[PDB]
Amino acid sequence: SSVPTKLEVVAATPTSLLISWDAGHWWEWVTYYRITYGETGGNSPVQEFTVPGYSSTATISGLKPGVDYTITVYAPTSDYGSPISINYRT
Amino acid sequence: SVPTKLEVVAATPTSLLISWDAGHWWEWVTYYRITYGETGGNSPVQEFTVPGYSSTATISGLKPGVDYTITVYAPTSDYGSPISINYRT
Amino acid sequence: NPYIYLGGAILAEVIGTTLMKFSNGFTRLIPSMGTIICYCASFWLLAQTLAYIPTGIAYAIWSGVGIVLISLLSWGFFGQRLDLPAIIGMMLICAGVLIINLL
Amino acid sequence: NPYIYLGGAILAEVIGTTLMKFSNGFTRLIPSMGTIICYCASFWLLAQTLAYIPTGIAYAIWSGVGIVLISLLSWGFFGQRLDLPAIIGMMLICAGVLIINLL
């Protein structure tokens, strides 16, 4: 019973990934989602960027092919719910 | 009052790098609009806008040998009359 | 006629303030959009009124009716009263506003 | 703590309105930027100080200290002194603030 839901990879690419999620109901829409992505066998930090809260899709570029990555989508605060995180191998 | 001293720094047969005195801090405007067209006018002219903190602007896509008229307008006519000059590439 | 645009700008700002309590620090989309729209509406109405109605009169009616409206909406959504000594101190400030405005 | 951020939003707003009077039709860059930063800060400051203090309670202290600092900064060094027998009304506003401030 939280935001967001259904974190899935729409389109893939050896260097890029297009992802989306269920932003929830209109009262559940936030003003900004921050997205965090990095190597799943983390040796180094997690690149994060924010995106306006009226969009449910986001594109990530500059990935190294063959490497498995972790992608997590957060909320402005922890009050909306726990962030959703998935894995994908480019 | 502003802008002031509109002159063409660099000049290529197809491009003109112009500059002006943007004023001085507490008299900086939000934006200037720069109009450049043929000195006679075949049918239209050309024009763009530049943020207020900038004092220079480049004008590309011109024809060699043609004399152009370049005018710079303040956001409103309250700052003074727009300054206009001429140049032949 | 301009007194009607004033009260509308008052109500618009009242609605904007009540919608801001719903925005959770501008972190909920739609309440945050509602506050921006309501304040832009009160901006446009107030600018149309100031061309006719004097400024000191506009603020006096604004602060008075505004204090009443958002206090009654703060009480109608998440009610409270004299959390600290005085509700009469609220209208006491309102009276202190009305003097240095009209007088 | 919450009344500190309320007074900070009051100060940020007053600075924004004064910079708007100095700026022309939102055309002078630096003061117009200042107004935007100030209104951005004030609205974010008031939003985060609204969850602690009641809305109508915050509305009064907001309007009160505002015009206090407005007439103060006006008479301060950008002219003005008019309606002089009304500083009592400023003391009224401060009185209404105190009976609602941490007492």
Numbering used by the authors:
A (entry chain C): 3 to 92
B (entry chain D): 4 to 92
C (entry chain A), D (entry chain B): 2 to 104
Lines quoted from the article behind this entry:
Representatives of the ‘Gdx’ (guanidinium export) subtype export a bacterial metabolite, guanidinium ion (Gdm+), in exchange for two protons. The overall fold and many of the binding site sidechains are shared between EmrE and Gdx-Clo, yet the two proteins have markedly different substrate selectivity profiles.
When combined with monobody L10, EmrE3 crystallized and diffracted to a maximum resolution of 2.9 Å. The structure of the EmrE3/L10 complex shows an antiparallel EmrE3 dimer bound to two monobodies in slightly different orientations via the loop one residues. The introduced E25N sidechain of EmrE3 is within hydrogen bonding distance of a tyrosine sidechain contributed by the monobody, and W31I contributes to a hydrophobic patch of the transporter/monobody interface. In the absence of ligand, EmrE3 possesses a deep, spacious aqueous pocket that is accessible from one side of the membrane. The E14 sidechains contributed by both subunits define the edges of this binding pocket. The present crystals formed at pH 5.2, at which both E14 sidechains are expected to be protonated. There is a small, spherical density in the vestibule between W63B and E14A that is consistent with a water molecule, although no other ordered water molecules are visible at this resolution. In the crystal structure, the S64 sidechains contributed by the two subunits are within hydrogen bonding distance and geometry, with strong contiguous electron density between them. As in Gdx-Clo, the TM2 helices splay apart on the open side of the transporter, defining a portal from the membrane to the substrate binding site that is lined with hydrophobic sidechains.
